[PDB]
Design an enzyme around this catalytic site. Structure first.
Site, PDB file in Angstrom:
ATOM      1  N   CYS A 259       0.865  -1.178   0.000  1.00  0.00           N
ATOM      2  CA  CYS A 259       0.000   0.000   0.000  1.00  0.00           C
ATOM      3  C   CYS A 259       0.903   1.230   0.000  1.00  0.00           C
ATOM      4  O   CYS A 259       1.212   1.813   1.039  1.00  0.00           O
ATOM      5  CB  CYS A 259      -0.943  -0.013   1.198  1.00  0.00           C
ATOM      6  SG  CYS A 259      -2.400  -1.071   1.003  1.00  0.00           S
ATOM      7  N   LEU A 260       1.329   1.623  -1.197  1.00  0.00           N
ATOM      8  CA  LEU A 260       2.201   2.773  -1.386  1.00  0.00           C
ATOM      9  C   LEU A 260       1.488   3.800  -2.254  1.00  0.00           C
ATOM     10  O   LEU A 260       0.903   3.450  -3.284  1.00  0.00           O
ATOM     11  CB  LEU A 260       3.528   2.358  -2.024  1.00  0.00           C
ATOM     12  CG  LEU A 260       4.655   3.394  -2.010  1.00  0.00           C
ATOM     13  CD1 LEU A 260       4.844   4.031  -0.639  1.00  0.00           C
ATOM     14  CD2 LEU A 260       5.956   2.769  -2.492  1.00  0.00           C
TER      15      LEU A 260
END
Lengths: 377, 75, 147
Positions: C85-86
């Site tokens: 989750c970037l």
């Protein structure tokens, strides 16, 4: 008011002499299991004059009264069959944002024109006989049906990240480092081929004097030129029944309402196809949440769905086939946070964090407050 | 001094600030000019996000510095 | 634009290697890349090596590549299956970004976990409550798997 004008438009449209049903009744028997095959066999051979009579539908070996419900069920089944991506006719715009659109790969079939004319006839039959499908296309599709110009903003409905990239190209100056040129690479069944937006397009870079033309060509190719033959056949099938002078009194939203009725989110499916982390189905917060969802307006339910999952659109088969940012992920409810904190959301994981409140009224107030900045429908 | 802040919408805002001005003061100026609450403002300079309770001098903000205004992340 | 850009990125990575993170096509295909990231020395994952699989969508560079971890890592912002989750790969992606920038961002993430996105709420809570226990668990996991 939106409703009053829409009702006036509907009454005026159905009052026209060119959309008046006859008196004779047309029977149409289709097996429940093989709905698509029989529907295509019968509908694609009917005549325009025949299709304008009253529609009477009887499922084989299923005799019963209230033919209205039977016809509605038949149209629901047919709509969920023909528009199913697994049939290689339509496809979702993105996996994480389920918006139906004509699949460019559908040209691989030996003759897609017959199937798309059948789809157009089905849509025209649904509009003509006051029956609703249950699909949700993208706004550019509706704008194409009404023959409206398509601009850059229309890519926002199709794909958000693509629109953001296009807007970034529009705003910031494009350098020579970006190896961008007038060519689009499309991978169709393994093999990747190049399509030139302009003649000799694969050998021209996009300077600061050409990026506007590049954006225009990209938008036109993505929204229109990739689906010329198929959409032309579909619109021919549609206009076979409904004259185009009638559809040109609506807009991109009223036509959606006319085709699919007043959109609503089922709650029973939502409850049956969810999962919990650190929560149990017998917990008080869960039952209070489900009661609140039961007695809520469609707009607020859509707002909550967009706040939690990340979009207000659902797949063609409800919450069962719900995809996350990585893979199939179902609506998850987790116990995370302190009492004072508002219910939080994790959109890329389809997760909702509801801290263990004490009273249902507090849960309702916190949940309503925590979704106000989100706009649904 | 003077600084420039570029938003995600491409808008450029000029602010008359000082190196000793706190992040809260600059956020108040941004709220006055645009109406964006200081809690919702996410200012990035030289890859570092400005935090409340500090000063511009803590982030080596100098004459005619360019900042980026972004919005909250989701997940 | 979906192949010349990839060739340019590969050529750039072939000229000035970061000397820590490497990337390259797997076999003979320009849309499936393997990447190797060295554990940062200032983070509990020090001394470890991690593998990433990068899939370039056909809409590149307008759409971000999909990067997935392969070796198990005890991190609040990395899911067990391997998803990341970037923000740079999800929402704040622009065509100017290259593949080396993504690798640098991930190598920076491996040192400063973001608690605002508790992709694994249990581990994020442990990180925010007992930092020493979280670091010990991360080092134990790196010893068990990365080595």
């Amino acid at each position: 008011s939106h409703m009053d004008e829409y009702q006036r438009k509907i009454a005026y449209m159905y009052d026209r002499p060119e959309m008046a049903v006859n008196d004779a009744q047309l029977q149409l028997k289709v097996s429940r299991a093989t709905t698509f095959e029989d529907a295509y066999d019968i509908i694609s051979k009917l005549s325009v004059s025949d299709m304008k009579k009253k529609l009477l539908i009887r499922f084989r070996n299923e005799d019963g009264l209230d033919y209205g419900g039977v016809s509605r069920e038949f149209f629901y089944i047919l709509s969920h069959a023909i528009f199913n991506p697994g049939y290689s006719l339509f496809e979702y715009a993105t996996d994480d944002n389920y918006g139906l659109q004509i699949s460019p790969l559908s040209s691989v079939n030996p003759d897609f024109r017959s199937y798309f004319r059948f789809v157009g006839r089905v849509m025209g039959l649904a509009i003509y006989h006051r029956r609703y499908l249950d699909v949700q296309f993208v706004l550019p599709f509706y704008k194409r049906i009404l023959q409206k110009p398509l601009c850059l903003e229309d890519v926002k409905d199709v794909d958000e990240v693509y629109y953001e990239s296009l807007k970034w190209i529009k705003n910031n100056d494009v350098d020579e480092s970006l190896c961008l040129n007038f060519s689009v690479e499309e991978n169709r069944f393994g093999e990747s081929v190049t399509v030139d937006l302009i003649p000799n397009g694969r050998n021209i870079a996009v300077n600061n004097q050409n990026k506007m033309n590049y954006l225009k060509a990209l938008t036109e190719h993505k929204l229109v030129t990739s689906t010329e033959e198929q959409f032309n056949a579909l619109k021919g099938g549609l206009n076979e029944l409904i004259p185009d002078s009638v559809l040109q009194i609506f807009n991109e939203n009223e036509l959606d309402t006319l085709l699919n009725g007043k959109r609503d989110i089922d709650v029973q499916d939502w409850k049956r196809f969810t999962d919990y982390r650190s929560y149990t189905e017998t917990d008080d917060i869960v039952i209070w949440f489900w009661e609140l969802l039961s007695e809520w307006s469609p707009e607020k339910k859509a707002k909550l769905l967009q706040f939690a999952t990340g979009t207000s659109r659902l797949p063609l088969s409800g919450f069962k086939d719900m995809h996350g940012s990585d893979g199939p992920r179902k609506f998850t409810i987790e116990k995370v946070g302190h009492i004072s904190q508002l219910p939080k959301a994790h959109t890329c994981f389809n997760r909702l964090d509801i801290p263990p409140y004490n009273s249902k009224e507090e849960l309702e107030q916190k949940l309503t407050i925590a979704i106000q900045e989100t706009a649904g429908f | 001094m003077q600084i420039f802040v570029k938003t995600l919408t491409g808008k450029t805002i000029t602010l008359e600030v000082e190196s000793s001005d706190t992040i809260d003061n600059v956020k108040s100026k941004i709220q006055d000019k645009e109406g964006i609450p200081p809690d919702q403002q996410r200012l990035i300079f030289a890859g570092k996000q400005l935090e409340d309770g500090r000063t511009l001098s803590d982030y080596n903000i100098q004459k005619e510095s360019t900042l980026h205004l972004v919005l909250r992340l989701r997940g | 634009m979906a192949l010349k850009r990839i060739n340019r990125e590969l050529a750039d990575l072939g000229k000035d290697p970061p000397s820590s993170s490497s990337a390259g096509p797997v076999g003979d295909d320009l849309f499936h890349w393997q990447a190797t990231i060295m554990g940062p020395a200032d983070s509990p994952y020090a001394g470890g090596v991690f593998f990433l699989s990068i899939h370039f969508p056909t809409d590149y560079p307008f759409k971000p590549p999909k990067v997935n971890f392969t070796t198990r890592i005890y991190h609040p912002n990395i899911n067990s299956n391997g998803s990341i989750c970037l923000d740079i790969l999800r929402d704040q992606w622009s065509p100017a970004l290259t593949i080396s920038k993504v690798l640098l961002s991930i190598s920076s993430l491996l040192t400063d976990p973001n608690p605002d996105d508790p992709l694994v709420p249990e581990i994020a809570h442990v990180y925010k409550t007992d930092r020493s226990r979280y670091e010990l668990s991360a080092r134990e996991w790196t010893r068990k798997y990365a080595i």
